[PDB]
Design a protein around this ligand. Structure first.
Ligand SMILES: O=P(O)(O)O[C@@H]1[C@H](O)[C@H](O)[C@@H](OP(=O)(O)O)[C@H](OP(=O)(O)O)[C@H]1O
Length: 284
């Protein structure tokens, strides 16, 4: 039997965050489960009743959703406004949310992650609830969820690079070998896109479950796992032989993720097996 929303909400009010953290890690609620409509707005909230629509009005002058394609704020990665399974109306709603966010949060200058997440939220809750999740995450003062400046963006992928150099040293050494002269920076600049634009939606959802509770470290972990799985795969295999991937390891990783050979649960099992990732270690 799987855990339920009200169970977790109780534990949360009591303050058993490790218990909640572990439930989220091990409970693989199906893709259709109604729990996320309730589970996710709470998780995001843990870190104004009609405030959203006020913002909506001030920007667009109306509550009514446009059919005209909406112009996105410059902080979005135009190449990565990943819609996933959102309908045409779903995308238009996403466009409205990020416009509102850009309007109310002027310090967000570069956040290629913000739109893909907005789309994910919209798969399980309403437009206003998605917003309130996002504003919670972005405004988090302790935990980090969504990078908002280009400086933060680059410190982050450099951090991930540093972590990968030790925890998946074989994979990175393997990259340098098959591709001499290659600077690993070019590869890790796109680390989040392995997850957000590679892994199947099914895998993303389970990842979001833990991510909305723990933060960006969950994403760090999954990045390591993908790198290990990709190196293992490269050792004996169809298309991921050195000759086909040396040309572009970058999208070789993306292609590999789209056809990732492990279940969401087996993927998540590896990530949390990884030890030593102290929060102030990654600050060093
Ligand atoms: O014991 P290990 O093997 O070193 O593993 C980590 C360690 O226990 C830290 O206390 C903790 O980091 P922080 O509490 O400082 O974030 C992290 O929690 P986590 O699994 O929730 O990330 C653990 O994974």
């Amino acid at each position: 039997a799987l855990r339920s929303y009200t169970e977790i909400q109780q534990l949360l009010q009591q303050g058993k965050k490790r218990d909640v953290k572990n439930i989220l890690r091990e409970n693989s609620w199906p893709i259709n489960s109604p729990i996320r409509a309730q589970l996710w707005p709470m998780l995001c909230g843990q870190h104004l009743d009609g405030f959203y629509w006020e913002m909506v009005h001030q920007v667009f002058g109306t509550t009514e959703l446009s059919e005209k394609p909406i112009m996105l704020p410059a902080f979005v990665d135009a190449t990565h406004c990943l819609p996933y399974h959102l309908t045409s109306t779903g995308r238009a709603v996403a466009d409205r949310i990020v416009n509102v966010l850009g309007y109310d949060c002027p310090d967000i200058t570069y956040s290629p992650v913000l739109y893909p997440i907005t789309s994910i939220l919209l798969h399980f809750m309403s437009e206003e609830e998605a917003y309130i999740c996002l504003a919670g995450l972005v405004g988090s003062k302790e935990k980090v969820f969504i990078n908002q400046t280009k400086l933060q963006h680059e410190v982050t992928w450099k951090t991930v690079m540093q972590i990968a150099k030790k925890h998946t040293k074989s994979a990175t050494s393997y990259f340098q070998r098959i591709c001499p002269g290659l600077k690993l920076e070019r590869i890790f600049m796109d680390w989040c896109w392995w997850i957000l634009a590679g892994l199947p939606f099914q895998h993303l959802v389970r990842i979001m479950d833990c991510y909305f509770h723990e933060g960006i470290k969950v994403l760090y972990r999954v990045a390591l796992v993908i790198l290990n799985l990709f190196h293992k795969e490269c050792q004996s295999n169809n298309e991921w032989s050195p000759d086909n991937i040396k040309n572009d390891i970058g999208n070789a990783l993306i292609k590999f993720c789209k056809k990732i050979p492990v279940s969401p649960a087996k993927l998540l099992h590896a990530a949390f097996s990884i030890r030593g990732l102290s929060t102030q270690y990654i600050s060093r």
